[PDB]
Amino acid sequence: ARQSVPVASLVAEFLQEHGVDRVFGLQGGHIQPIWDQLARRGVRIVDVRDEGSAVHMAHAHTELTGQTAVAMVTAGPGVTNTVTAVANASVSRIPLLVIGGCPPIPQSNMGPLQDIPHTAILEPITRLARTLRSADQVLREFDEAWARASGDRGEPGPVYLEIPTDVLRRDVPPALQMREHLRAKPKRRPQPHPDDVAAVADLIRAAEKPAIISGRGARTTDGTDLVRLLDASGAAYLDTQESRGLVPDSHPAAVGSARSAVMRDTDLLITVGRQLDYQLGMGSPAVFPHAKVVRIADTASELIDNRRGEVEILAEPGAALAAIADALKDHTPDTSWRDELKAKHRKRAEDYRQALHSTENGADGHIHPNRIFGALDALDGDVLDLGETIMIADGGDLLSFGRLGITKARRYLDAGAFGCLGVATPFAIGAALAYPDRPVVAVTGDGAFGITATEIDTAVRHDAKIVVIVSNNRAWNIQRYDQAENYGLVVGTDLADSDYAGVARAFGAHGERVTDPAELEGAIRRALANAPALVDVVTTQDAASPDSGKGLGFVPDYQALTPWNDAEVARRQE
Amino acid sequence: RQSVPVASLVAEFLQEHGVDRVFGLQGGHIQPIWDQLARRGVRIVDVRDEGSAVHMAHAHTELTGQTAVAMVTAGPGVTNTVTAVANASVSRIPLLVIGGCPPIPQSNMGPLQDIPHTAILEPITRLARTLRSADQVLREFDEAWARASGDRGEPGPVYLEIPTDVLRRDVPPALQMREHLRAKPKRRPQPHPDDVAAVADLIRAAEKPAIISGRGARTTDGTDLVRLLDASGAAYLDTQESRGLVPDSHPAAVGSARSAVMRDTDLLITVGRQLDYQLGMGSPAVFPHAKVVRIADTASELIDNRRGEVEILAEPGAALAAIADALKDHTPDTSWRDELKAKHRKRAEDYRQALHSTENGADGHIHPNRIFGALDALDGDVLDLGETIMIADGGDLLSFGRLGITKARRYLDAGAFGCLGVATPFAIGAALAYPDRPVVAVTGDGAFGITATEIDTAVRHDAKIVVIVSNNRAWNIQRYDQAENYGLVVGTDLADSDYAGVARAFGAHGERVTDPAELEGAIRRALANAPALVDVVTTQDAASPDSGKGLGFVPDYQALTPWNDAEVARRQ
Amino acid sequence: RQSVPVASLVAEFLQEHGVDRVFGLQGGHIQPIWDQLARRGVRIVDVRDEGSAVHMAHAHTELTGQTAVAMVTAGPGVTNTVTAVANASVSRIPLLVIGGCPPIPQSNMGPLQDIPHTAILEPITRLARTLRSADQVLREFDEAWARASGDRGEPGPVYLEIPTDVLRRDVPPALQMREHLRAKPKRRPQPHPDDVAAVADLIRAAEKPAIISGRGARTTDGTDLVRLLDASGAAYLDTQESRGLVPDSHPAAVGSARSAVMRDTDLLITVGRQLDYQLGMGSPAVFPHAKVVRIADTASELIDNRRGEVEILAEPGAALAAIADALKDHTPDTSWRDELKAKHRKRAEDYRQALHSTENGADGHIHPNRIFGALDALDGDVLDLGETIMIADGGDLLSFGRLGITKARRYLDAGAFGCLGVATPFAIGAALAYPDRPVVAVTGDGAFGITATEIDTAVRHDAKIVVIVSNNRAWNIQRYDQAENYGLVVGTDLADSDYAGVARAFGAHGERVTDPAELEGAIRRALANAPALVDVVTTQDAASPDSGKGLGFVPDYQALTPWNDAEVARRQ
Ligand SMILES: CC(C)(O)C(=O)SCCNC(=O)CCNC(=O)[C@H](O)C(C)(C)COP(=O)(O)OP(=O)(O)OC[C@H]1O[C@@H](n2cnc3c(N)ncnc32)[C@H](O)[C@@H]1OP(=O)(O)O
Ligand SMILES: CC(C)(O)C(=O)SCCNC(=O)CCNC(=O)[C@H](O)C(C)(C)COP(=O)(O)OP(=O)(O)OC[C@H]1O[C@@H](n2cnc3c(N)ncnc32)[C@H](O)[C@@H]1OP(=O)(O)O
Ligand SMILES: CC(C)(O)C(=O)SCCNC(=O)CCNC(=O)[C@H](O)C(C)(C)COP(=O)(O)OP(=O)(O)OC[C@H]1O[C@@H](n2cnc3c(N)ncnc32)[C@H](O)[C@@H]1OP(=O)(O)O
Ligand SMILES: Cc1ncc(Cc2csc(CCOP(=O)(O)OP(=O)(O)O)c2C)c(N)n1
Ligand SMILES: Cc1ncc(Cc2csc(CCOP(=O)(O)OP(=O)(O)O)c2C)c(N)n1
Ligand SMILES: Cc1ncc(Cc2csc(CCOP(=O)(O)OP(=O)(O)O)c2C)c(N)n1
Ligand SMILES: [Mg+2]
Ligand SMILES: [Mg+2]
Ligand SMILES: [Mg+2]
Ligand SMILES: [Mg+2]
Ligand SMILES: [Mg+2]
């Protein structure tokens, strides 16, 4: 038998009933009424140093667990501190709820403390951004916003709700507190149409070099239906930064070191929960010169962008993949192309991984960042199980080296399609609190690190067992290198030889500096035994990542990378 | 003139408009402009977080009156500015943010960092545009610069972004017009004599006139304001945004009598000041006896919440001088002002003296007021507070700072927006603007963690700042609201962090203080070795004035409980 | 493929996507596209007011299921569409508006008609963009077309504009991709069997199940809906947007029992229908006994106001069929449905009979119900109402129309938006879509004055419409609220205008009727001579159902007084 209670109590209850067991945030007066109620219900409060980091932690939680996560921030600068992290979640299509404080209704437009247009600022990068002015309707609005965060009436992504403090304190009569709005809801499961399933299976049977490229929507599955389709199709398989870990490394389809060869030669590109954005050359005929196109997703955000499918399936991707696998029951696939790529991939990836253990110092006498990945690979099955480890990468050159150097991980997170520097520490904290049994390892550039370094404090106060490894090359180095190479003028891209280990120790974390690459395995072993911990690696400026070599820093007219841009320029003059 | 890329013409526009430094953080989308600024000899002050670059621009413009410039790359570079842009918008500070953005051919296709920057910033800018016509970029820059001053709006931040393909396009020489490149003077609208006369009539009829200053008054040197105070007999209050205009010894300057002035004035004259929550919305509940007059060069300081019986829209100096002239032959009645001044002398002097001996709290740690006591004791020894730029930031620390900082050439703080983390970026902007003297920033530990890594910026660019941290291991004004009013403290504690160690890790001088008697020495050594941080282990057992008045509770009608109580009584 | 201008490629995209007509009003900014459509043989239906062109597109898409297209020039051409765009957005109707806009070089310089079209339309469109990259225009068109269907949003209007310099730019052939030119099928997401089973379980447990249809059900042919009604024993209500799916004689069809069904159902099943104000917000105050199930192909008809114990997101036909199949072996309990059906037969038959003899009001003029009586009497004589598209518009006239129009192949009206003036533009779109039969639009005089000049469009394009005007010299539902509830009638009277004369002035057949016995003859002659208008001099002494229920008062919680009273009781 419900009673009359304040909006603030109902909001705390809505969240807990929807399966929220933690709220990331930073306290202010505008949200204290909710903050208090969450604590009294036993919801864990993870309080941070910068509200942006709380939204990064929510992001990591939802991406890893599939549970929509929640950040709570006060009016004015509390909300404006979230915009980068909200934009990043919007770009990556991650369900999350930001609850903001805002001034009481009587003072609207009168210059109360922190009256800025939060909803107008956030509308462009949210699925919903509202001020809730009717106490009796707050539960309803919460439940509808939660559904919109999952993608209802839009596509998956962040939502924003704010409740004027006078409304937070208003009582709601029990008759208006409806169980259907309080209760957790299951995810939607739209199913494929059998005609579209049949049509894709026909394209696969007629293709000689089918390739699957996965993304976000595939990563919401466990990968088993994806594997069933790979087996039934003979397709080669590429993942992206947002879809690592779905297919065993030894699978005959898994050809991660043959990215260019797959895109150049596939006659049937099958996207699974994946945008054809700049990360896949806009799906341009310039980059996929032979490919017919099929798109499978539970959101048209991964069906209609840049290329249209000969067939497009809007359905739960696991169901779609299983249905197509079933339709290929009596198909004997032609695997010769996939198998030739897999034979070459085995050698290229094994040679690359082996060479990580002995990469030479640069001309400045400092460690090559590849040695960090070499050291991690050497510790695998000794003091950590990389196969159970959540790996995070962030920075410029460091991030690009990380994409090749991180091959075994239960899960991978990074700067995202948005190129959001500073996610490493907040992501590692969200990851470690989600999965408390194993250290989380975040490898970051020094530039990226300076943005969220003070969250080391959060890791210590909340006991998040993270290991942060900093590639300390005294520079925004991928940028420094573009300046030097293409302008003959390096200016405002140098940083200093800062003591990041000392910063970590100043906030009560374990910290150590490494200048000798032979010390790396030991330093990372000690960091793992004493997490939360930072290893500050003095790295070379004389090292170009693959992203560096390919003009990422230059921003060409048509494509993110020079080679792809050159192919696009040729395509325009046919 | 020759044919040159948009990127060159932008660098030239800035330098010709008097820009000698740009704050920012490099990315590929803005490198073409970045390069051209460096080749022209414009100083690039590169930061650790783009938000801090916009804070630095803000401090430069507020102190110098010269519109300042931040430059950031596409996507997260622009989104990292939103708090600092909002803070400048709230404070009405002219500044230009130049963002990178993707090339035109890739619009809406998911290129790297294609988010709607202009839609995000439109609500908190005077202008937010994407510049797609190479030949018109110069024009757009000049018009945006005028709008940052308040043209077609009110003073505040503007945002311009140039797709990278447009940055690289040549402009023919005939389209590069001198009138858009050249620096422009500020506007100087003059008062109408009938409005001046009508204000002088109101002053002659008033027994207890009071002047409250703000942003617009602070754009003057104070001399015209002092002339009107002399001619009117008015009491004088400033606000956080208008400190240092009137000598402390002036018979009108009654800074410890804020409540008595608002309760009893029969003529409130606002000078370039909003009647926002900082002045009780100008409500009759807070000014129960006051007729109202408003003077400003922007209706943002004329129409908000209370209307003037007279409103003057003019350059405020000219308006103040004209009213002073019109009070030729008036003998002002100063008895109320003088009675407040006598009480003020006692109250302010006893308060400042007590700063040198404030007891430790019950937890055995330093009362933050001892930091202001130590700074007062060093005045005329190792620093001239009268020439010093002082910055305050935090919760309880900020409220204590408002009373403890009484001599400063200039004062900056969290602003009407309550923007925590401004201390370090403001101190850097201030120090590079005025390189002759250390700048002193006093901050809460909570606020400091937001922008602490900008200590690195201060060291790399040799900004002579001294940061003093009130390290009370807490968001303490919030922790205190929780404990007092909910009996539940949760998620407002921090730790006993080594902020001296953080500062030393970034190559700054650093010292920790636990004994209040060590403060003078530590501050002396910090001043001699700037950039420097003093980490003061402070008490949680200390309630600021803001704490005692319910700032943390957020009442229905007013920011503070006493004002809210008065508003509830007015409403029935 | 060859190199061709953007303007040609746009014309080709439209024709390939199945567009055989474009509604609009010519201007210089869109002439390049206008010309190319005509050269390709796409019919141009030019109108008197751009709003009407978008109304015509709306009616075309709602009736045919083919996305329709309006094209308007820059500035006032685009701003004239805003009501019709809002109406399509509220009703969730796919349509494309193509606006002109100024060339890129002149952006922000005050060129002719540079207003922010995309900012004005963003809040009421699924997409609103300015297309600045010639090679990407085709792609943008195809993606916008998909978003109009509901992709990345929900069904509704999209807006695209192309600066005139871009319209004139060539696209190389390699960039003209077949996949963007070609027509696309509608999406067909399928139900999950566990959700289908869980709905069938709820139906088996229910004693008084009721199905209420809307937009999404009306995109089907009704056969799957009738299968579920047969298998479930459910009562059936439609709404204005879902008429004609279930034969009137079906044992479930209880259209005169709306209140009894909502009061007593223990299982409300919405089929492609919002629980907006038209269904009492789905409030427990209006459905006090109902569990809720929601079925739709868009969460716009699943999450609003009430959540389902089950929600099915799927093509509604497939969902209905699957649930019918799952009710294999169920014997439904029809006693409640049958008791409503027996009462419905009497009430609806007595009501329809009474339409032929309704008395004149106290002012001696025709009761508008006689118009529906006359149409009923001509059925099977000079027109087949069962094949006729019927349109209603106005205040009291619209409410009388909801009861008086019982046979129509299809029905359109003012919509949930209450958009007065749709009658004539809807009738024109309907008539050009279905050229074999006259379309009959019944309208208030108030509503008609908004779009009356589109009679000219009907004549110039030979749309066989018959417009019947309820000429009560008033905005009468409003005049009646004023008189009853304020004792002051002011600014709601119109005059005894000659609407027949207006119609004849634009070359249409026209007749005025003052004697109710003349209605059958006048409507016969109008049908034989379409396009035609019948101007009926109607009473002000006639309260519609909407009038009696306080629609005009706007209560706090619900659109109607009785529902509002029930909501107030629920709230205490
Ligand atoms: C513009 C600026 C600088 O101001 C910014 O803001 S940048 C923002 C921060 N940076 C980012 O967010 C990065 C954005 N860029 C990208 O995400 C990528 O450049 C891309 C998605 C556009 C392209 O990535 P790739 O498709 O090239 O994928 P990678 O995983 O990086 O693969 C690189 C190469 O290594 C190869 N490879 C991968 N795993 C390997 C393995 N295990 N062993 C050996 N080789 C391996 C791979 O095949 C490929 O070689 P190739 O076939 O093209 O020759
Ligand atoms: C809501 C939350 C907590 O989540 C937030 O986000 S808060 C954001 C962070 N904080 C802020 O941004 C501050 C916001 N508040 C304010 O700016 C102020 O509370 C106020 C402007 C609204 C009110 O300030 P006052 O008018 O009280 O001004 P102060 O300079 O603080 O003076 C306080 C008292 O000390 C007095 N005083 C000033 N200088 C003195 C002196 N030198 N010696 C002695 N007394 C002195 C002054 O007269 C007054 O006493 P009284 O007259 O009312 O009795
Ligand atoms: C693009 C499209 C078609 O789709 C649209 O939407 S157009 C929208 C509807 N039309 C408009 O709103 C008109 C917009 N255009 C204009 O306003 C004008 O074209 C203009 C302002 C841009 C240019 O006007 P002018 O400066 O040429 O001024 P007018 O008063 O029209 O003068 C025309 C000529 O007559 C002359 N003139 C004026 N008064 C006269 C007099 N009394 N006797 C003799 N000659 C006279 C005048 O000097 C001038 O000749 P000249 O010196 O250029 O040779
Ligand atoms: C918030 C923001 N501002 C700028 C940029 C632009 C950028 C992308 S990569 C990069 C250099 C990163 O340096 P780091 O030290 O982390 O890595 P390394 O190259 O190994 O030295 C910058 C400045 C982005 N994406 N985000
Ligand atoms: C970005 C932002 N997030 C939250 C808040 C809300 C707030 C206002 S005051 C306060 C406490 C500040 O603690 P600090 O340690 O600096 O000061 P002290 O009381 O002396 O211990 C908070 C959290 C604001 N204004 N801005
Ligand atoms: C564009 C617009 N402006 C006002 C209104 C408000 C309204 C709703 S009903 C009504 C009266 C309609 O008078 P009409 O003469 O057509 O009907 P009748 O009652 O039979 O005499 C008005 C003015 C609406 N909905 N739309
Ligand atoms: Mg930030
Ligand atoms: Mg939005
Ligand atoms: Mg670096
Ligand atoms: Mg503190
Ligand atoms: Mg009427």
Numbering used by the authors:
A (entry chain A): 15 to 588
B (entry chain B), C (entry chain B): 16 to 587
Task: Cite, word for word, the article reporting this structure.
Interestingly, a unique feature of the actinobacterial 2-hydroxyacyl-CoA lyase is a large C-terminal lid domain that, together with active site residues L127 and I492, restricts substrate size to ≤C5 2-hydroxyacyl residues.
To study the underlying reason for the deviating Km values, we have determined the crystal structures of the enzyme mutants E493Q and E493A in the presence of the substrate 2-HIB-CoA and inactive cofactor dzThDP to 1.76 Å and 1.63 Å resolution, respectively. As expected, the conformation of the Q493 residue of the mutant is almost identical to the one of WT E493 and interacts likewise with Q41. However, in case of glutamate as exclusive acid/base catalyst, typically, a mutation to glutamine would have a more dramatic effect, e.g., a >5000-fold reduction in conversion rates. Therefore, alternative proton transfer routes might be present, possibly, through poorly coordinated water molecules.
